[PDB]
């Protein structure tokens, strides 16, 4: 009887949450921003093509100088790219060819990679010996490590496939904080510009906003109907961008605690692999399993552009911190710097 | 090539040397055979890897041919999210147990765990990534099945079975039941084998089946098939 009473209390509390969310809604985003000028047509050309990978490309990350790149591929290679001149600054052989994420440190001193061995390895780019060597391997996850992101300094947050996220301490090597509350595999992370709050999206069709200092979840957003593969912040750090396997993007919000926009098309049945914004937060670029990328117009619903230079699944996206380029990686082992 | 500074010339030379290293290491890795090894609980994967924390790669060599066996048994997660990693392996080594028609799952005492194994086989050979990868089905523990079938009829697992309960034909029936789950009989082939716990021809069989797979892939890409 107590278990059923507690379940009924949880159900009525969820109903109260739904009523509160419905009460704080006046008019959707499609109504207030109806009279703004359209973006029109956005055309991009492939300025550079970065060749050298010999397998499917699963991750990439831009440097904070908006010129250096890192990319991870299944052939056991982590390659640092010079976007301007196509030169290869570094080529790092991973101890594990099963890599599904990579991050580049904001200070540029470090890179990270993770995958199917449940361990996040960190490499020191600027050493006195001239080579790149492993500085620390972080172990402690039981499910596959699906995303990693460096914080401001000497700290990394990793989301894995065992429904738990972890904030580590690279100086020591143990989980400073553990975030729990997901009932499915966590596939994507995103960090606020102020780097105090972060967001994890999971296969439970849910996205949770955690607190790094406290270590406890603040808000939970639902509404999707399948697994979640991509997540991103708005440039002001007060909105979402969730990409799911049911061919829909959604724009949540942290203060209103309610979904705002749905970016969908009847001609699209494939899932979404990566999602990112532009510098101003007006263009939302989303990768697809339809072998191309779509440039949606936020604050509206109509499409704005198509980036169809690839002949396989687009697995990763990225917009420079400056905002002058959009790199794109796919399973045909080519990066393309659009502009 | 002419408006580059001296430092930029050296940077481009470094990039070219890195490209050469990548090409050499990538030619080294296209000469190794990768075999995704699957199974179910207590199938016999341990004895298979013996007689011949995430993924556990294994390396071995037989007659100047290097093999890599990517066991993923210990990783409990959604297969839908990392099974496309292995899209591109030469063959799949699927191990099942013949003596599993009388045992039952610990979680639920029904479906005799063999329909459960067949569920995984159906889910793996009808995938949308493995539409062109062969399979090497190992039917493990054939010696224990011989005594198990002499005491208990095989109809316990199969209500529709109709035949004498001897090993030489019950084994044929179970082989046929596993092979009938294939939905693309032209694109991919299943190389079934009856192995014991103390058998020494399993690695040789893997070698023959994988040379066959490679020859067929070559004939397919050359246009002759």
């Amino acid at each position, epitope marked *: 009887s107590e278990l059923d009473q507690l379940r009924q209390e949880a159900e009525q509390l969820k109903n109260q949450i739904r009523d509160a969310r419905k009460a704080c809604a006046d008019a959707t985003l499609s109504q207030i921003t109806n009279n703004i000028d359209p973006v029109g047509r956005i055309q991009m050309r492939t300025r550079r093509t970065l060749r050298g990978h010999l397998a499917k490309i699963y991750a990439m990350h831009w440097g904070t100088d908006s010129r250096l790149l890192v990319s991870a591929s299944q052939d056991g290679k982590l390659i640092i790219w*010079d976007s301007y001149t196509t030169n290869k*600054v570094h080529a790092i052989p991973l101890r594990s060819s099963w890599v599904m994420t990579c991050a580049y440190a904001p200070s540029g001193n470090y890179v990270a990679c993770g995958g199917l061995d449940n361990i996040c390895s960190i490499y020191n780019l600027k050493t*006195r010996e001239g080579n790149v060597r492993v500085s620390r391997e972080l172990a402690g996850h039981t499910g596959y490590l699906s995303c990693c992101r460096f914080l401001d300094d000497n700290q990394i947050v990793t989301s894995s496939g065992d429904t738990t996220c972890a904030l580590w301490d690279i100086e020591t090597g143990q989980q400073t904080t553990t975030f729990t509350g997901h009932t499915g595999d966590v596939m994507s992370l995103s960090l606020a510009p102020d780097t105090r709050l972060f967001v994890s999206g999971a296969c439970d069709a849910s996205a949770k906003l955690w607190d790094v200092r406290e270590g406890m979840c603040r808000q939970t957003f639902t509404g999707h109907e399948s697994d979640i593969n991509a997540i991103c912040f708005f440039p002001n750090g007060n909105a979402f961008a969730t990409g799911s396997d049911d061919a829909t993007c959604r724009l949540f919000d942290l203060r209103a605690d309610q979904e705002l926009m749905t970016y969908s098309h009847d001609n699209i049945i494939c899932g979404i692999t990566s999602v990112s914004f532009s510098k101003s937060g007006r263009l939302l670029l989303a990768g697809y399993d339809d072998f191309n990328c779509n440039v949606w117009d936020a604050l509206k619903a109509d499409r704005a552009g198509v980036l169809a230079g690839h002949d396989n699944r687009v697995s990763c996206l990225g917009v420079t911190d400056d905002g002058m380029a959009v790199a794109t990686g796919s399973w045909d082992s080519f990066l393309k710097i659009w502009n | 090539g002419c408006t580059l*500074s001296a*430092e930029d010339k*050296a940077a481009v*030379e*470094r990039s*070219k*040397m890195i490209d050469r290293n990548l090409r050499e290491d990538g030619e080294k890795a296209a000469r190794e055979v990768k075999l995704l090894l699957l199974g179910a609980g207590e199938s016999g994967k341990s004895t298979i890897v013996k007689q011949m924390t995430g993924i556990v790669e294994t390396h071995f060599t037989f007659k100047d041919l290097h093999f890599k066996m990517f066991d993923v048994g210990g990783q409990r997660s959604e297969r839908k999210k990392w099974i496309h990693c292995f899209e591109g392996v030469t063959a799949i080594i699927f191990c099942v147990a013949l003596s599993d028609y009388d045992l039952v799952l610990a979680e639920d005492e029904e479906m005799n765990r063999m329909h459960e194994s067949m569920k995984l086989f159906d889910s793996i050979c009808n995938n949308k990534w493995f539409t062109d990868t062969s399979i090497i089905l190992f039917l493990n523990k054939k010696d224990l099945f011989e005594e198990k079938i002499k005491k208990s009829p095989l109809t316990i697992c199969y209500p529709e079975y109709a035949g004498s309960n001897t090993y030489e034909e019950a084994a044929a029936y179970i082989q046929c039941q596993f092979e009938d789950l294939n939905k693309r009989k032209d694109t991919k082939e299943i190389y079934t084998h009856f192995t014991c716990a103390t058998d020494t021809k399993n690695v040789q069989f893997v070698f023959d089946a994988v040379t066959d797979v490679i020859i067929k892939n070559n004939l397919k890409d050359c246009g002759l098939f």
Partner: single-chain antibody
Amino acid sequence: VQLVESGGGLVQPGGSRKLSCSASGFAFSSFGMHWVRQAPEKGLEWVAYISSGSGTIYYADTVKGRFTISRDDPKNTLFLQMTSLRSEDTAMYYCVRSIYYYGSSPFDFWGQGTTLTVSDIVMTQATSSVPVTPGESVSISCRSSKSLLHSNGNTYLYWFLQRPGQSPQLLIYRMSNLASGVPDRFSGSGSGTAFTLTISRLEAEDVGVYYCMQHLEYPLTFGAGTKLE
């Protein structure tokens, strides 16, 4: 990181001599290597250069065709074969490490020295010696034949510092950056053909001779050397 070099000594003119440098402490196979000699007249001037892939060799347009430079990666040893030694080829030789990619330090580490005795854009320093005062800052000037600012934005001017009885140490590369282990008191500026180096608090270890260098194009040319005492 240590480069130990040998092969010097008294040699009669017209002979031959091999200078050998052994590298121990870094991946020598990925570093381009130079040779810089300094006569007792306190003048640094570049000699040769071999790249990382054992190609793209350069020589100064004074001794070309007489010296050969080679590297051995399995042994990690750099050889310089010297033939027809003239009377003007007596100097102390240093082996210099170098690495080139986006944002590296191409003259970070120098050798130890080898005394050998026998029996084009120009870089000009302002003065030869400057009086010092620890209370006030110290400014050193340098001028070049033409502008060192390339079209890609880099201004290939370097700054060194040779203490008495020691080897030169990199302080500033590309006239706006700072090396590893160098205190942040040093700063560099300039525009076009004229550059300057500023030191805030001169100390006991800040005395010595300061040298300019350009890496815009070969041959690399040093300055006269301002002597802070």
